[PDB]
Amino acid sequence: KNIIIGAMTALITPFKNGKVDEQSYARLIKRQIENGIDAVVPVGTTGESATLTHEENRTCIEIAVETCKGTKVKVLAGAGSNATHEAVGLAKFAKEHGADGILSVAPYYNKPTQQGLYEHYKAIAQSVDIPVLLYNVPGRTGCEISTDTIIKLFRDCENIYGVKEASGNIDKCVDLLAHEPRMMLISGEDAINYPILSNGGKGVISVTSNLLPDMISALTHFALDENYKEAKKINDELYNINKILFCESNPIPIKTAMYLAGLIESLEFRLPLCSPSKENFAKIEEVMKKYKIKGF
Amino acid sequence: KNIIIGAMTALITPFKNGKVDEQSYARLIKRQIENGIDAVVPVGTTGESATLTHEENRTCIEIAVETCKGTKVKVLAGAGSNATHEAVGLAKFAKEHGADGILSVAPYYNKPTQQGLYEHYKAIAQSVDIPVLLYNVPGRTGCEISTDTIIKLFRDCENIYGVKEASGNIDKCVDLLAHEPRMMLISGEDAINYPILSNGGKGVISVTSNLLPDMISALTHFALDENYKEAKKINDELYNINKILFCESNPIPIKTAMYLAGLIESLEFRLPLCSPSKENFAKIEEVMKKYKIKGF
Numbered sequence: 079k080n081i082i083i084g085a086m087t088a089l090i091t092p093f094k095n096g097k098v099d100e101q102s103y104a105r106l107i108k109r110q111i112e113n114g115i116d117a118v119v120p121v122g123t124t125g126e127s128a129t130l131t132h133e134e135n136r137t138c139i140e141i142a143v144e145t146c147k148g149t150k151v152k153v154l155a156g157a158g159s160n161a162t163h164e165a166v167g168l169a170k171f172a173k174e175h176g177a178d179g180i181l182s183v184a185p186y187y188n189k190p191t192q193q194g195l196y197e198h199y200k201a202i203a204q205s206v207d208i209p210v211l212l213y214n215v216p217g218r219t220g221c222e223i224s225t226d227t228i229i230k231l232f233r234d235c236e237n238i239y240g241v242k243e244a245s246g247n248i249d250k251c252v253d254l255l256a257h258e259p260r261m262m263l264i265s266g267e268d269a270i271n272y273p274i275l276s277n278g279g280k281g282v283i284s285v286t287s288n289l290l291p292d293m294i295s296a297l298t299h300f301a302l303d304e305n306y307k308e309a310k311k312i313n314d315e316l317y318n319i320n321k322i323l324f325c326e327s328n329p330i331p332i333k334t335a336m337y338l339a340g341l342i343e344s345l346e347f348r349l350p351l352c353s354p355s356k357e358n359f360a361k362i363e364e365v366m367k368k369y370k371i372k373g374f
Numbered sequence: 375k376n377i378i379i380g381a382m383t384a385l386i387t388p389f390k391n392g393k394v395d396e397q398s399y400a401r402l403i404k405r406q407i408e409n410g411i412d413a414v415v416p417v418g419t420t421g422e423s424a425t426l427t428h429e430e431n432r433t434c435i436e437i438a439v440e441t442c443k444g445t446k447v448k449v450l451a452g453a454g455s456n457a458t459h460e461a462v463g464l465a466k467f468a469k470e471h472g473a474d475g476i477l478s479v480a481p482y483y484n485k486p487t488q489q490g491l492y493e494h495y496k497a498i499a500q501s502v503d504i505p506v507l508l509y510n511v512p513g514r515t516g517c518e519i520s521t522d523t524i525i526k527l528f529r530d531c532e533n534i535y536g537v538k539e540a541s542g543n544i545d546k547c548v549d550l551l552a553h554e555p556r557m558m559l560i561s562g563e564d565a566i567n568y569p570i571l572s573n574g575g576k577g578v579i580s581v582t583s584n585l586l587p588d589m590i591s592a593l594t595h596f597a598l599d600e601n602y603k604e605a606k607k608i609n610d611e612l613y614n615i616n617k618i619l620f621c622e623s624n625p626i627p628i629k630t631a632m633y634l635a636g637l638i639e640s641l642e643f644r645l646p647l648c649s650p651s652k653e654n655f656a657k658i659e660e661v662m663k664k665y666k667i668k669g670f
């Protein structure tokens with residue numbers, strides 16, 4: 079299969095006066111490229127896909143594709159939906175507008191059965207000829223793609239190449255790669271990036287890398303070379319910020335940190351997301367002081 | 375506060391060749407009216423709100439309003455979204471098209487904080503002048519509206535009048551009505567309708583009533599009349615069907631049962647929902663045989 083692996087960033091979506099700040103977005107993507115990131119993920123969970131319109135989802139993908147041209151950096155477009163017809167539409171748009179692949183979250187809220195998840199992803203995969211990465215995040219979606227369903231989809235659909243796991247379940251990571259070692263297991267949980275990579279995972283789709291792209295890139299590339307001492311050292315150093323960036327629901331802490339770092343102009347969300355509490359604002363600020371944050 | 379309480383049905387949405395079967399929908403609502411139901415809820419979770427378009431969500435509300443006009447039966451329109459701007463748009467449409475109130479699910483997938491939930495629902499409640507019922511279902515949304523947030527919304531916003539609880543947590547039900555006895559607590563979990571009503575809950579928004587509207591409305595009316603012996607008797611009789619209707623994710627079993635009863639023409643869902651397993655299909659059919667199912 080064709081694949082998108084390595085160190086990848088779930089891009090935040092900056093707003094100004096309620097609209098997508100398109101210049102800021104392109105600028106933030108350039109900063110990721112310049113700090114060793116292998117791929118960017120526009121409009122995932124961290125990018126507030128829920129509150130963007132379909133048009134804005136499409137715009138953000140286009141900005142990422144245009145910004146990455148002439149570089150090695152890939153665009154793994156956020157194209158998921160809890161409605162299969164919507165997910166197919168977003169997948170097709172991403173393919174026709176030059177994305178290298180798509181990330182497709184398990185349907186949220188309507189809790190499909192494993193049979194329904196299989197048919198959902200089969201319909202998406204049959205609709206494009208670019209790579210598709212599954213994305214399991216049960217704490218947000220209310221459902222879990224089982225190991226059996228992931229393995230069946232990987233084996234049955236030529237362009238489904240692996241899964242982004244955000245489930246805090248290293249037993250499942252062992253189960254996946256022990257029964258199907260050819261898939262690309264991708265960490266979607268920054269605190270346990272190193273354990274996932276050391277069991278044979280082949281990349282990360284990171285929140286922390288919005289702020290510290292050089293550290294996440296270094297961690298991943300050390301691990302892929304089996305330089306596990308160095309990769310573990312960075313993973314350990316990053317633990318405190320990796321956890322504080324979830325002191326409130328992602329992306330509230332990461333946007334707060336990007337604002338505190340001067341990397342975005344305004345600390346704006348779309349409702350129902352909003353600014354953190356004053357106490358957590360202070361906690362985020364305090365933890366940031368322990369890390370060197372690259373500018374532009 | 376203006377309120378919508380009593381026995382209410384979370385209407386299934388029948389499909390024919392992939393489209394909303396509008397004549398079937400109207401026929402199903404008339405059947406609810408004939409069997410003592412006090413209000414209907416178009417396009418809630420049970421109505422496959424996730425896979426309807428915004429236009430179909432609006433069409434179903436219109437059909438409900440029109441079918442109920444000139445009867446005692448109210449329309450509590452499903453108008454929720456995980457994006458506040460979408461939720462406000464749906465609320466306004468329901469108001470302008472004659473719904474008696476709206477049901478508004480807590481944002482799913484993006485996990486707002488309690489502050490965010492307060493601002494979400496305050497924005498919705500300020501956009502219309504009809505009653506708003508909150509809706510807590512953490513197993514599907516990934517978030518919980520806390521008791522403190524519900525009570526503040528009830529006290530601070532004139533039209534927020536209560537909450538549909540689908541959380542399996544009778545302790546929270548006690549907490550809510552012990553600290554704010556003026557709110558309308560509505561059962562969103564059929565198996566425990568009687569315990570919620572016996573603690574001072576004032577209605578149900580039912581899945582089972584799609585199939586057995588006479589039994590659910592009787593249960594509710596016995597309880598509101600303080601005949602706890604008879605309300606409990608019906609709740610107990612209904613336990614087996616109340617549980618089997620969740621052997622797979624709702625509304626997969628209830629649509630299967632409606633098809634098996636001859637009340638809808640075809641067993642059609644929109645992906646990612648799909649037909650149940652053959653084993654669960656047989657289980658639903660077996661349990662249904664023990665109940666008397668009203669026709670048209």
Ligand SMILES: N[C@@H](CCCC[NH3+])C(=O)O
Nearest residue numbers: 127128130131132135457
């Ligand atoms: N709020 C809806 C629509 C989002 C459309 C853009 N990603 C959802 O989360 O599915």
Ligand SMILES: N[C@@H](CCCC[NH3+])C(=O)O
Nearest residue numbers: 161423424426427428431
């Ligand atoms: N699938 C999206 C859009 C639904 C629009 C109609 N209710 C969601 O679940 O939020």
Ligand SMILES: [Mg+2]
Nearest residue numbers: 230231233234
């Ligand atoms: Mg197979």
Ligand SMILES: [Mg+2]
Nearest residue numbers: 092102342343
């Ligand atoms: Mg900015």
Ligand SMILES: [Mg+2]
Nearest residue numbers: 410411412446
């Ligand atoms: Mg009545």
